[PDB]
Amino acid sequence: DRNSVDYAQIASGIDTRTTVMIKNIPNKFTQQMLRDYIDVTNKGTYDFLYLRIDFVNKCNVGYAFINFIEPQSIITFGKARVGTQWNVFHSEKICDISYANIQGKDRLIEKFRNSCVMDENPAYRPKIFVSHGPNRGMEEPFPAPNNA
RNA sequence: GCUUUUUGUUCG
């Protein structure tokens, strides 16, 4: 209901949400393969990316999270991938998306900066990329923790 | 044939 993606509301500017859940991902798909998968259609249009990893079984958990700098980049990705199979690892999964429950790079940094997922391998951690300017799209170090 | 489905306080 609430996390349903409607491309007509993105295009009309009613729904200004930028964080999206990338659901139904092959479990042996990696952070590199996902960045590459997105970069086909949406190179430099996103400023956050997090593919959740099972640290014990050493493979993704079936979903990822991406934040688009502009909501209209959700139509570009959505129209290209939603409803399509991945063609890797004999997986019959089909790509799908929905809005994320945590919206925005600032809110996502708040959440992840003091997390124990930041203490793991960098390929297992959430990543961020410059949102605006001539450095737009370049990977940035994640803001350090601020616990007590 | 390849898997966790709204983000690890639970390490599966």
Residue numbers in the entry: 580 to 727
The authors write:
Upon meiosis onset, Mmi1 is lured by a ribonucleoprotein (RNP) complex, composed of the nucleocytoplasmic shuttling RNA-binding protein Mei2 and the DSR-containing lncRNA meiRNA, that accumulates in a single nuclear body overlapping the meiRNA-encoding sme2 + gene. Both Mei2 and meiRNA are essential for the assembly of this structure and the completion of sexual differentiation. Interestingly, Mei2 mutants lacking the RRM3 domain (residues 592 to 750, hereafter called RRM3Mei2) failed to accumulate meiotic mRNAs, suggesting that Mei2 RNA-binding activity is required to inhibit Mmi1 function. In this study, we show that the RNA-binding activities of Mmi1 and Mei2 are crucial for their mutual control during mitosis and further identify a lncRNA, termed mamRNA, as a major regulatory and bridging partner for both proteins in the nucleus.
Using isothermal titration calorimetry (ITC) and size exclusion chromatography coupled to multi-angle laser light scattering (SEC-MALLS), we found that RRM3Mei2 tightly interacts with a poly-U15 in a 1:1 stoichiometry. Given the interaction of a guanine (G11) with Sxl F170, which corresponds to Mei2 F644 that is essential for Mei2 function in vivo, we also tested the influence of one (U7GU7) or two (U6GGU7) Gs in a poly-U15 oligonucleotide and observed a considerable increase of Mei2 binding to these RNAs. We next solved the crystal structure of RRM3Mei2 bound to the GCUUUUUGUUCG 12-mer. As revealed by the PISA server, several Mei2 residues also form specific hydrogen bonds with U4 to G8, rationalizing the stronger affinity for U7GU7 than for poly-U15. U4 binding pocket is solvent exposed and hence any nucleotide may fit in it. Further, expression of the Mei2-F644A mutant did not lead to the accumulation of meiotic mRNAs in mot2∆ mei2∆ cells, consistent with RRM3Mei2 RNA-binding activity being also required for Mmi1 inactivation.
